[PDB]
Design a protein around this ligand. Sequence first.
Ligand SMILES: Nc1ncnc2c1ncn2[C@@H]1O[C@H](COP(=O)(O)OP(=O)(O)O)[C@@H](O)[C@H]1O
Lengths: 61, 339
Amino acid sequence: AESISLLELCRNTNRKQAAAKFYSFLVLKKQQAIELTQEEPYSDIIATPGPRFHGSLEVLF
Amino acid sequence: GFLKLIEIENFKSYKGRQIIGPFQRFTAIIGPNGSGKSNLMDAISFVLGEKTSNLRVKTLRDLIHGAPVGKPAANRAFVSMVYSEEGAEDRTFARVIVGGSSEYKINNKVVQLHEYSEELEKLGILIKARNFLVFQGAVESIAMKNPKERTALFEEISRSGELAQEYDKRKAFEQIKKERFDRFNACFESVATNIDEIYKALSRNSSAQAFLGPENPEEPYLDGINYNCVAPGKRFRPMDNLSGGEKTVAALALLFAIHSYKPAPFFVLDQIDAALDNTNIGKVANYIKEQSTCNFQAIVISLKEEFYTKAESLIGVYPEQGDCVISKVLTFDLTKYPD
Ligand SMILES: Nc1ncnc2c1ncn2[C@@H]1O[C@H](COP(=O)(O)OP(=O)(O)O)[C@@H](O)[C@H]1O
């Protein structure tokens, strides 16, 4: 299955952009487009497919 | 001291045991609508002793996750706050819901509400006054007060308003007239000393100016409190004659200057930017960022990216569906990125 790291998505971005990517994980999780895993606080946030969206997560981001 | 983290268990939409934070000196709580931002606010109020009726329930057990739908998830719930002071071990303050009443604990020793309140006061946390909290509309509430209502607010916070009934009772009554005076000035003069520098900082402009003055310099409680501002590019006016955005900044300066007297170690700001605009929202945000470094820890619940991107730390809230809704939090560090 397909997985996506927020910290990789955020490499070479500024604070506004990084925060917007973070906020998008919250929005996409509410809409059930993804699942979220964070092993421990302030560690990496991993996105995986969710029940309500089926296209490529890579392309989604 | 500083609020290091919150541990929640089965409180409102925070099903199960969850760790909130750790906090940084400037942390913003964000998320899409209905995920649990304001319940987290209630969690903080709850561990700091807020009365049940201010927590949007009718009774204590309705705070347990699942109670509003008739399906409580446990017989017991709690919120704990880990408080850390450089030089000392960490202290845990907890309020547990046990058989429909509150159990208070410090470092896992049950205490009564009096001891809990008293130990919190010694840290500068005042649970009855709520010095740590800026509610929504707090700005607009301030911005609407006239000199006499400002005195009243100063009467309450200084508590000279307590000596008020005993005051005119004695009409050599200067014994209390001197001490209602001194109790009003112990508070007012500190605010008056600080408001000018706060107003420059907020305005981000050294030519801004602010003055707070008693109308009756002898018995200030008897009269209004005049508030004058030199807004950037204007001439000194009474604050009440200011206009939209300019009035908002002066309100904000007066708000923070009220809180610079006996400040709380940490400051919970609940959507203080719902009444801002791009023409100033970042100077409020930059002010908070600047103050968080040494003066106070800031915990902002915010909806405006131009505010919460100045934070060091983002606690993002998101929902799942279940009994009611299930809230969970992610932590994200903004200090890795530039701009
Ligand atoms: N005891 C509870 N158990 C489960 N869900 C609750 C409980 N109390 C409140 N909620 C839910 O919390 C949800 C929204 O949380 P809230 O913090 O108020 O929204 P927002 O993120 O917009 O501030 C509401 O759907 C509400 O039904």
